[PDB]
Write a protein that binds this ligand. Structure first.
Ligand SMILES: *[C@@H]1O[C@H](CO)[C@@H](O[C@@H]2O[C@H](CO)[C@@H](O)[C@H](O)[C@H]2NC(C)=O)[C@H](O)[C@H]1NC(C)=O
Ligand code: NAG
Ligand code: NA
Length: 205
């Protein structure tokens, strides 16, 4: 029910303020999905406190209705505890949403590092190869932080973490889409997840 989880080696102490603030942060994510598909939070609210302050975001796919966004984020919160347990930093990516938290702010910090890239099996079908090429490339020329394109039965999606600037988003996506095309462009789908953005496509289904 998830794509990847990243959990820091460094752990907070049991029943510490950090743990308590994290749990409060995560509950806040769920609440916030009623209003918006992306939000950033600090707990506690106010001046950073040594050790215990938590920073986080959630982000739903850019076309999700609030009900679908709540369901996804709730599930992410329910899963991240099991996977990341007492890590200071946790990042859980699902198909339709992510949650991310850390013990320092990561807002507006570019990070194009690769997390996960998987390609499908290979597609003489120049129609299919053309469509895939055109769809994947269309994601790069598209605007803003959530981009989709489709031709026939070929569908592409690209999304930047909501904290990135316009420029940072395009830079991240340029990399992700470049990798997606270069490595998976002849395949029956594929996905590239970088730290702060992703690009993916599917053929059929
Ligand atoms: C976030 O958590 C990490 C891990 O506790 C902090 O890094 C540690 O900092 C302490 C003292 O400040 C050092 O004794 C450790 O060597 C560090 N550990 C690691 C793995 O780097 C980091 O300072 C915390 N950041 C904030 C802003 O609280
Ligand atoms: C984070 O949230 C604050 C307060 O809600 C807002 O002022 C700011 O624009 C947000 N920043 C980012 C990078 O998401
Ligand atoms: Na969509």
């Amino acid at each position: 029910n998830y794509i990847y989880a990243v959990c820091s080696p460094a752990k907070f102490s049991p029943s510490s303020g950090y743990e308590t603030n994290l749990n409060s942060l995560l509950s806040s994510f769920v609440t916030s999905t009623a209003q918006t598909r992306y939000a950033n939070f600090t707990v506690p609210t106010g001046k950073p406190e040594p050790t215990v302050t938590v920073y986080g975001i959630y982000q739903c796919r850019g076309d999700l209705d609030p009900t679908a966004c709540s369901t996804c984020v709730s599930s992410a919160v329910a899963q991240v505890g099991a996977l990341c347990s007492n890590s200071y930093s946790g990042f859980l990516q699902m198909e339709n949403c992510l949650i991310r938290y850390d013990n320092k702010s990561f807002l507006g910090v570019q990070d194009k590092t690769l997390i996960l890239n998987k390609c499908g099996q290979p597609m003489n079908d120049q129609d299919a190869l053309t469509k895939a090429s055109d769809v994947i490339g269309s994601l790069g020329t598209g605007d803003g932080s959530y981009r989709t394109g489709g031709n026939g039965n070929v569908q592409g999606v690209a999304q930047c973490s909501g904290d990135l600037s316009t420029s940072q988003c395009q830079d991240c996506l340029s990399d992700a889409i470049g990798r997606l095309k270069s490595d998976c462009g002849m395949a029956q789908g594929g996905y590239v997840y970088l730290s702060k953005c992703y690009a993916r496509f599917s053929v059929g289904g």
